[PDB]
C-alpha cells in the first residue's frame, strides 16, 4: 500500500512466508494450536504483500520435497505427505477467498 517497498523487506516477508507456511504445516495437526493464526498470518501477509500464488505453489514444492526426502531416508510412512497437499490447497483456497471478497460488485 505504501511507496514501492525495498527488495530486502520483500525478501524478509518471504523469509517469514517460508517459515510461516512451514509453521502452518507443523500446526496443521496441532493439538490446541490455532493453525488459523498461522494461516491468518500467511493469508494476511500474502494479500498485503501482493504475493502471487506461484511462490505459495513453488515454496510448497520445495518443502514438500523436504518431507518425502526424510521419509525415504528415515524409512517413514509417506502417507502424511497428503497433509502438505491439504495444507497447500486449503491455504491457497483461503487467500483465494479473501481475493474474491476484496472485489466490490455492482448491485
Amino acid at each position: 500500500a505504501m511507496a514501492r517497498m525495498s527488495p530486502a523487506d520483500k525478501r524478509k516477508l518471504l523469509d517469514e512466508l517460508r517459515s510461516i507456511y512451514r509453521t502452518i504445516v507443523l500446526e496443521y495437526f496441532n493439538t490446541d494450536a490455532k493453525v488459523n493464526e498461522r494461516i491468518d498470518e500467511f493469508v494476511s501477509k500474502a494479500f498485503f504483500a501482493d504475493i502471487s500464488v506461484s511462490q505459495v505453489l513453488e515454496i510448497h514444492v520445495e518443502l514438500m520435497d523436504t518431507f518425502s526426502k526424510q521419509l525415504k531416508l528415515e524409512g517413514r510412512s509417506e502417507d502424511i505427505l497428503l497433509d502438505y497437499r491439504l495444507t497447500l490447497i486449503d491455504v491457497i483456497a483461503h487467500l483465494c477467498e479473501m481475493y474474491r471478497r476484496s472485489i466490490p460488485r455492482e448491485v
Binding site: D15, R18, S19, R22, V25, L26, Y28, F29, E62, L63, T66, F67, Q70, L71, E74, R76, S77, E78, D79, I80, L82, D83, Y84, R85, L86, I89, D90, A93, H94, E97
Partner: protein, 34 residues
C-alpha cells in the same frame, strides 16, 4: 533450509488412497444455500 529440522510430524495420520482431499469445502459452497 533456514535453521532447524523440518518433518511435519510424519507417520501419524492414516489416509485413503485419494486422501481426504479438500473435503473441508471451506464452507464457501454456501453461496447456493439459504
Amino acid at each position: 533450509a533456514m535453521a532447524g529440522i523440518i518433518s511435519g510430524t510424519p507417520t501419524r495420520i492414516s489416509v485413503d488412497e485419494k486422501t481426504e482431499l479438500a473435503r473441508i469445502a471451506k464452507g464457501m459452497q454456501d453461496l447456493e444455500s439459504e
